[PDB]
Amino acid sequence: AMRYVASYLLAALGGNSSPSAKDIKKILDSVGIEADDDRLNKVISELNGKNIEDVIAQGIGKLASVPAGG
Amino acid sequence: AMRYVASYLLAALGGNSSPSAKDIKKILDSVGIEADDDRLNKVISELNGKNIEDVIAQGIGKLASVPAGG
């Protein structure tokens, strides 16, 4: 569930600490990523109820980086 | 060091698994975030040498979410 976290984070850093899922969609539009509303708000809500790092390190996994040179 | 991770992630999810720091800048431009080159590539390199979740959960911290209702 790392798809929206990227844009969620960006929006937060851009001054919008409480980012709307629509904004998320737009930021995903910038790099060409899909975005649902329900799942998106759920991921957002995860990050909101937990710590970003926590939700990240749980909901990303080895989808993040493959061992390049390892 | 979560500033670039957001856009780094987005770029990765947008099909560019090995994202250029310039792309990062552009994605940060979308939401209005600053971006150096050295520090940026360093954060990127952190995420590249480690796991994203790991680097995130290390280099974000309580900068992520404040206890809203806690």
PDB file of C-alpha atoms in Angstrom:
ATOM      1  CA  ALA A   1       0.000   0.000   0.000  1.00  0.00           C
ATOM      2  CA  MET A   2       2.844   2.378  -0.857  1.00  0.00           C
ATOM      3  CA  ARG A   3       1.164   3.855  -3.936  1.00  0.00           C
ATOM      4  CA  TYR A   4      -0.497   6.753  -2.108  1.00  0.00           C
ATOM      5  CA  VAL A   5       2.062   7.155   0.661  1.00  0.00           C
ATOM      6  CA  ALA A   6       4.424   8.771  -1.808  1.00  0.00           C
ATOM      7  CA  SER A   7       1.991  11.513  -2.780  1.00  0.00           C
ATOM      8  CA  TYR A   8       0.575  11.623   0.747  1.00  0.00           C
ATOM      9  CA  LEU A   9       4.055  12.422   2.027  1.00  0.00           C
ATOM     10  CA  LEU A  10       4.702  15.006  -0.716  1.00  0.00           C
ATOM     11  CA  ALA A  11       1.435  16.790   0.039  1.00  0.00           C
ATOM     12  CA  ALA A  12       2.277  16.818   3.756  1.00  0.00           C
ATOM     13  CA  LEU A  13       5.700  18.319   3.079  1.00  0.00           C
ATOM     14  CA  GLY A  14       4.179  20.876   0.736  1.00  0.00           C
ATOM     15  CA  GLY A  15       2.430  22.502   3.660  1.00  0.00           C
ATOM     16  CA  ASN A  16      -0.680  20.353   3.682  1.00  0.00           C
ATOM     17  CA  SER A  17      -0.117  18.175   6.747  1.00  0.00           C
ATOM     18  CA  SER A  18      -3.685  16.914   6.500  1.00  0.00           C
ATOM     19  CA  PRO A  19      -3.786  16.045   2.770  1.00  0.00           C
ATOM     20  CA  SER A  20      -6.958  15.343   0.828  1.00  0.00           C
ATOM     21  CA  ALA A  21      -7.118  12.158  -1.230  1.00  0.00           C
ATOM     22  CA  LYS A  22      -7.903  14.304  -4.274  1.00  0.00           C
ATOM     23  CA  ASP A  23      -4.588  16.086  -3.856  1.00  0.00           C
ATOM     24  CA  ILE A  24      -2.997  12.649  -3.639  1.00  0.00           C
ATOM     25  CA  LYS A  25      -4.571  11.769  -6.985  1.00  0.00           C
ATOM     26  CA  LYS A  26      -3.161  14.937  -8.549  1.00  0.00           C
ATOM     27  CA  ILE A  27       0.345  14.253  -7.257  1.00  0.00           C
ATOM     28  CA  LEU A  28       0.026  10.697  -8.564  1.00  0.00           C
ATOM     29  CA  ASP A  29      -1.128  12.251 -11.849  1.00  0.00           C
ATOM     30  CA  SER A  30       2.190  14.115 -11.935  1.00  0.00           C
ATOM     31  CA  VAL A  31       4.154  10.844 -12.140  1.00  0.00           C
ATOM     32  CA  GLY A  32       1.353   8.817 -13.712  1.00  0.00           C
ATOM     33  CA  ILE A  33      -0.022   6.702 -10.869  1.00  0.00           C
ATOM     34  CA  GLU A  34      -3.522   5.308 -10.299  1.00  0.00           C
ATOM     35  CA  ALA A  35      -5.619   6.308  -7.290  1.00  0.00           C
ATOM     36  CA  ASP A  36      -8.808   4.968  -5.767  1.00  0.00           C
ATOM     37  CA  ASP A  37     -10.715   6.958  -3.141  1.00  0.00           C
ATOM     38  CA  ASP A  38     -11.581   4.337  -0.553  1.00  0.00           C
ATOM     39  CA  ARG A  39      -8.258   2.481  -0.525  1.00  0.00           C
ATOM     40  CA  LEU A  40      -6.466   5.815  -0.701  1.00  0.00           C
ATOM     41  CA  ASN A  41      -8.250   7.323   2.292  1.00  0.00           C
ATOM     42  CA  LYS A  42      -7.639   4.015   4.077  1.00  0.00           C
ATOM     43  CA  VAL A  43      -3.889   4.233   3.490  1.00  0.00           C
ATOM     44  CA  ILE A  44      -4.046   7.887   4.495  1.00  0.00           C
ATOM     45  CA  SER A  45      -6.039   6.958   7.577  1.00  0.00           C
ATOM     46  CA  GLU A  46      -3.440   4.294   8.409  1.00  0.00           C
ATOM     47  CA  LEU A  47      -0.700   6.923   8.254  1.00  0.00           C
ATOM     48  CA  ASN A  48      -2.894   9.291  10.267  1.00  0.00           C
ATOM     49  CA  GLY A  49      -3.681   6.817  13.043  1.00  0.00           C
ATOM     50  CA  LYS A  50      -0.135   5.498  13.126  1.00  0.00           C
ATOM     51  CA  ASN A  51       3.284   6.932  12.394  1.00  0.00           C
ATOM     52  CA  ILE A  52       4.188   7.411   8.731  1.00  0.00           C
ATOM     53  CA  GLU A  53       7.400   5.429   9.151  1.00  0.00           C
ATOM     54  CA  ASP A  54       5.477   2.646  10.859  1.00  0.00           C
ATOM     55  CA  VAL A  55       2.771   2.434   8.200  1.00  0.00           C
ATOM     56  CA  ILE A  56       5.467   2.693   5.534  1.00  0.00           C
ATOM     57  CA  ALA A  57       7.720   0.042   6.952  1.00  0.00           C
ATOM     58  CA  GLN A  58       4.676  -2.203   7.324  1.00  0.00           C
ATOM     59  CA  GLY A  59       2.814  -1.528   4.079  1.00  0.00           C
ATOM     60  CA  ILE A  60       5.728  -1.236   1.652  1.00  0.00           C
ATOM     61  CA  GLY A  61       7.921  -4.284   2.155  1.00  0.00           C
ATOM     62  CA  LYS A  62      10.219  -5.644  -0.549  1.00  0.00           C
ATOM     63  CA  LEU A  63       8.098  -3.776  -3.073  1.00  0.00           C
ATOM     64  CA  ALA A  64      10.440  -0.912  -2.233  1.00  0.00           C
ATOM     65  CA  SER A  65      13.921  -1.929  -3.340  1.00  0.00           C
ATOM     66  CA  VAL A  66      15.318  -5.124  -4.809  1.00  0.00           C
ATOM     67  CA  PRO A  67      18.883  -6.153  -3.788  1.00  0.00           C
ATOM     68  CA  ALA A  68      20.871  -4.479  -6.555  1.00  0.00           C
ATOM     69  CA  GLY A  69      24.353  -5.809  -5.959  1.00  0.00           C
ATOM     70  CA  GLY A  70      23.492  -8.033  -3.049  1.00  0.00           C
TER      71      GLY A  70
ATOM     72  CA  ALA B   1      15.246  13.310   5.389  1.00  0.00           C
ATOM     73  CA  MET B   2      11.698  12.550   4.246  1.00  0.00           C
ATOM     74  CA  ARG B   3      11.460  15.484   1.838  1.00  0.00           C
ATOM     75  CA  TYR B   4      12.694  13.578  -1.214  1.00  0.00           C
ATOM     76  CA  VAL B   5      11.456  10.136  -0.215  1.00  0.00           C
ATOM     77  CA  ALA B   6       7.929  11.199  -1.068  1.00  0.00           C
ATOM     78  CA  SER B   7       8.766  12.120  -4.652  1.00  0.00           C
ATOM     79  CA  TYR B   8      11.349   9.335  -4.855  1.00  0.00           C
ATOM     80  CA  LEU B   9       8.602   6.852  -4.037  1.00  0.00           C
ATOM     81  CA  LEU B  10       6.135   8.447  -6.488  1.00  0.00           C
ATOM     82  CA  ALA B  11       8.681   8.322  -9.303  1.00  0.00           C
ATOM     83  CA  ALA B  12       9.412   4.670  -8.506  1.00  0.00           C
ATOM     84  CA  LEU B  13       5.721   3.796  -8.612  1.00  0.00           C
ATOM     85  CA  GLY B  14       5.300   5.719 -11.849  1.00  0.00           C
ATOM     86  CA  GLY B  15       7.441   3.176 -13.639  1.00  0.00           C
ATOM     87  CA  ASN B  16      10.810   4.721 -12.905  1.00  0.00           C
ATOM     88  CA  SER B  17      12.230   2.339 -10.307  1.00  0.00           C
ATOM     89  CA  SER B  18      15.599   4.045 -10.603  1.00  0.00           C
ATOM     90  CA  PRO B  19      14.501   7.698 -10.337  1.00  0.00           C
ATOM     91  CA  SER B  20      16.697  10.663 -11.202  1.00  0.00           C
ATOM     92  CA  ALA B  21      17.024  13.439  -8.634  1.00  0.00           C
ATOM     93  CA  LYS B  22      15.813  15.882 -11.293  1.00  0.00           C
ATOM     94  CA  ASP B  23      12.562  13.964 -11.542  1.00  0.00           C
ATOM     95  CA  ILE B  24      12.366  14.188  -7.764  1.00  0.00           C
ATOM     96  CA  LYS B  25      12.681  17.967  -8.019  1.00  0.00           C
ATOM     97  CA  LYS B  26       9.834  18.092 -10.546  1.00  0.00           C
ATOM     98  CA  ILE B  27       7.546  15.983  -8.368  1.00  0.00           C
ATOM     99  CA  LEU B  28       8.434  18.228  -5.430  1.00  0.00           C
ATOM    100  CA  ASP B  29       7.636  21.165  -7.729  1.00  0.00           C
ATOM    101  CA  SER B  30       4.152  19.681  -8.116  1.00  0.00           C
ATOM    102  CA  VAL B  31       3.418  20.118  -4.398  1.00  0.00           C
ATOM    103  CA  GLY B  32       5.850  22.987  -3.867  1.00  0.00           C
ATOM    104  CA  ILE B  33       8.837  21.408  -2.118  1.00  0.00           C
ATOM    105  CA  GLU B  34      12.523  22.374  -2.159  1.00  0.00           C
ATOM    106  CA  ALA B  35      15.200  20.040  -3.509  1.00  0.00           C
ATOM    107  CA  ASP B  36      18.972  20.029  -3.353  1.00  0.00           C
ATOM    108  CA  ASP B  37      21.022  17.709  -5.574  1.00  0.00           C
ATOM    109  CA  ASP B  38      23.625  16.334  -3.196  1.00  0.00           C
ATOM    110  CA  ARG B  39      21.366  15.748  -0.193  1.00  0.00           C
ATOM    111  CA  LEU B  40      18.687  14.446  -2.538  1.00  0.00           C
ATOM    112  CA  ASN B  41      20.929  11.889  -4.230  1.00  0.00           C
ATOM    113  CA  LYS B  42      22.165  10.956  -0.747  1.00  0.00           C
ATOM    114  CA  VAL B  43      18.634  10.241   0.458  1.00  0.00           C
ATOM    115  CA  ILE B  44      18.002   8.395  -2.794  1.00  0.00           C
ATOM    116  CA  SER B  45      21.232   6.475  -2.340  1.00  0.00           C
ATOM    117  CA  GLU B  46      20.167   5.610   1.219  1.00  0.00           C
ATOM    118  CA  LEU B  47      16.913   4.174  -0.110  1.00  0.00           C
ATOM    119  CA  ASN B  48      18.844   2.408  -2.872  1.00  0.00           C
ATOM    120  CA  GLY B  49      21.408   0.793  -0.577  1.00  0.00           C
ATOM    121  CA  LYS B  50      18.803  -0.053   2.037  1.00  0.00           C
ATOM    122  CA  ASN B  51      15.113  -0.865   1.992  1.00  0.00           C
ATOM    123  CA  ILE B  52      12.732   2.048   1.439  1.00  0.00           C
ATOM    124  CA  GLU B  53      10.759   1.180   4.562  1.00  0.00           C
ATOM    125  CA  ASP B  54      13.975   0.988   6.558  1.00  0.00           C
ATOM    126  CA  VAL B  55      15.327   4.319   5.337  1.00  0.00           C
ATOM    127  CA  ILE B  56      11.868   5.819   5.820  1.00  0.00           C
ATOM    128  CA  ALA B  57      11.332   4.519   9.304  1.00  0.00           C
ATOM    129  CA  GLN B  58      14.817   5.752  10.192  1.00  0.00           C
ATOM    130  CA  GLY B  59      14.923   9.111   8.423  1.00  0.00           C
ATOM    131  CA  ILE B  60      11.358  10.314   8.994  1.00  0.00           C
ATOM    132  CA  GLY B  61      10.639   9.978  12.698  1.00  0.00           C
ATOM    133  CA  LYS B  62       8.020  12.066  14.494  1.00  0.00           C
ATOM    134  CA  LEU B  63       8.258  14.538  11.630  1.00  0.00           C
ATOM    135  CA  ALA B  64       5.657  12.262  10.056  1.00  0.00           C
ATOM    136  CA  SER B  65       2.547  12.432  12.217  1.00  0.00           C
ATOM    137  CA  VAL B  66       1.783  14.181  15.485  1.00  0.00           C
ATOM    138  CA  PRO B  67      -0.563  12.395  17.961  1.00  0.00           C
ATOM    139  CA  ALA B  68      -3.907  13.823  16.866  1.00  0.00           C
ATOM    140  CA  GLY B  69      -6.245  12.533  19.534  1.00  0.00           C
ATOM    141  CA  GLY B  70      -3.645  10.747  21.597  1.00  0.00           C
TER     142      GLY B  70
END
